[PDB]
Structure formats: structure tokens, C-alpha cells
Design a protein around this ligand. Structure first.
Ligand SMILES: Nc1cc(-c2ccccc2)no1
Ligand SMILES: Nc1cc(-c2ccccc2)no1
Ligand SMILES: [Mn+2]
Ligand SMILES: [Mn+2]
Lengths: 137, 137
């Protein structure tokens, strides 16, 4: 059976600015780099940046809702969002759901999110106020 | 700071076949389903399937290398891969450039992977068989 996410791999158009974004701006740990990629960690997450000449710098209106959310504590959320804002990182959505969320773009337009709250927290809120058509299992 | 992937959200074009793929075929746990999405877990991974009219069924030659790998044990890897093959699940890559992996597509062409091994194990393997120009930190 499957036991979790093993790794997330993001195709990148330019390796250096992507390493700078994930390591220096977002604070992830850089473990290795090679001519066409890098390995970083963020808590348990194994992130791979893969240099790919097929990656387009993609405006958010031109990509679907697929996105990658990173955990942060409530206490740290506002200062991290302010850090991204200072760095000029673009926002692609405003938060309208439960739990703090900041929706931001990576240099290639990958859709990212900072989120505070677990699946258990979300399910508890949904049980009290179910979405349209919502069924629990 | 950031610690871990909070959740992975995949945009899907048809909710029912996608839920069936992740729950029935891949064995993930379905927690809730509503008219426009579903919440599943795979170990400690929170997966959200989000119905998105913008999602296109995308052939693998039309998308970049961005992909999502799920952990599986050495004992279960081959029989799970063979069952996906026998079920007609499409593939997108054959060459094992990052260890023991099986590369397959979801119904919308999201690039998925079964992988055996941790980041620490991949780094150890790379010390002996490094990618071109590899540096370790
Ligand atoms: N139960 C179930 C099987 C599948 C499937 C999807 C694509 C290809 C082959 C099988 N999806 O759900
Ligand atoms: N065939 C079928 C439909 C469903 C369903 C479950 C929860 C919510 C909406 C639909 N489960 O099986
Ligand atoms: Mn999200
Ligand atoms: Mn991979």
C-alpha cells in the first residue's frame, strides 16, 4: 500500500533563481545540486527541482487550480507572508476558507500556498458547515 | 518557518473517475466527497481533488516534468506496479534515473510515481552514482 508522499518534483526553467527562491527566500534546506536539478527538504517533504526546457513561465490565469501548500504555524504566518510581499512575490488568490492561507507563485508560476491547519481541522469545520453535496466516510 | 507539505491539491476534470482512481485503484483513504471535490489521505498526506473546469486531460508529452511520487515498500513495489499495468494505467517514463520508480498517469494526465526509498537513501546512492555535476551539502 502507499504510505505517504515520497517527493514533490517541480519542473523549473532556470535552476539558480528557483534554488534561491526555495532555499533562501522560503528557508528550505538544500541537500544537493547538480547540473540539471536540486534536492531540498522542508520538514518531512523531499522537494526536487528539475531543470526542464519544457517548463513555461506560466501566468496564473493560464494554469489550473493544482497547487502545493506548505505548513506554517499561526504564530509565524503573518511575518512569512510579509517576507514574501517584501520580495515582490505575486499572489494568485485571496483566502476565503477556514485556516489562514496565503496563495503565492514561484518564479515559474507554480501555484503555492502557506496554510495553517490540518485535514482533521478542515473536516471538523466541514462537519459543522458541510459544503454543497458533502458526504463523509 | 515552513515545515512539511500541508496538502497537495490536484485539479480534476471529472470528479467521480478521479475519486475512484485515488481511492479504489491506489488505495488511498476517502474522508469526504462533495459536489466539487474530495479529501483523501495517503499516510500523512492530505490530498484534495478539486473539480476544475479549466483542467485539461493532458498527454505526457505536452506537460513538463512536474510530478508527484508516493512511497511504497520494497516488498510491495513490483506487485503494485504490475497491477497498475494490468489495469491499463498509462505511463510516461521508463528509465529509472532516480532509483526504484514506476511512472504512471492519472485520468487527467497528472504525472505520478511509485518510489521505494527516502531522500537519505537517494543521496547515499547518488554518492556512488551521482548525477552530472553533483555537489552535496
Ligand atoms: N477503479 C479504478 C480503476 C481506474 C483506472 C483508471 C485509469 C486507467 C486504468 C484504471 N480508475 O478507478
Ligand atoms: N456512484 C457514486 C456516487 C457517490 C457519491 C458519494 C458522495 C457524494 C456524491 C456522490 N458515491 O458513489
Ligand atoms: Mn489549498
Ligand atoms: Mn520522481
Amino acid at each position: 500500500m502507499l504510505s505517504g508522499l515520497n517527493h514533490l518534483t517541480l519542473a523549473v526553467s532556470q535552476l539558480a533563481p528557483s534554488v534561491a527562491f526555495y532555499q533562501q527566500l522560503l528557508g528550505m534546506t538544500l541537500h544537493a545540486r547538480w547540473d540539471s536539478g536540486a534536492y531540498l527538504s522542508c520538514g518531512d517533504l523531499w522537494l526536487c527541482l528539475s531543470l526542464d526546457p519544457q517548463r513555461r513561465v506560466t501566468p496564473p490565469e493560464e494554469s489550473d487550480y493544482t497547487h502545493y501548500a506548505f505548513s506554517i504555524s499561526e504564530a509565524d504566518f503573518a511575518s512569512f507572508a510579509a517576507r514574501l510581499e517584501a520580495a515582490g512575490v505575486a499572489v494568485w488568490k485571496l483566502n476565503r476558507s477556514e485556516g489562514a492561507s496565503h496563495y503565492f507563485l514561484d518564479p515559474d508560476g507554480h501555484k503555492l500556498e502557506l496554510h495553517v491547519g490540518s485535514l482533521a481541522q478542515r473536516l471538523a469545520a466541514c462537519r459543522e458547515q458541510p459544503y454543497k453535496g458533502m458526504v463523509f466516510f
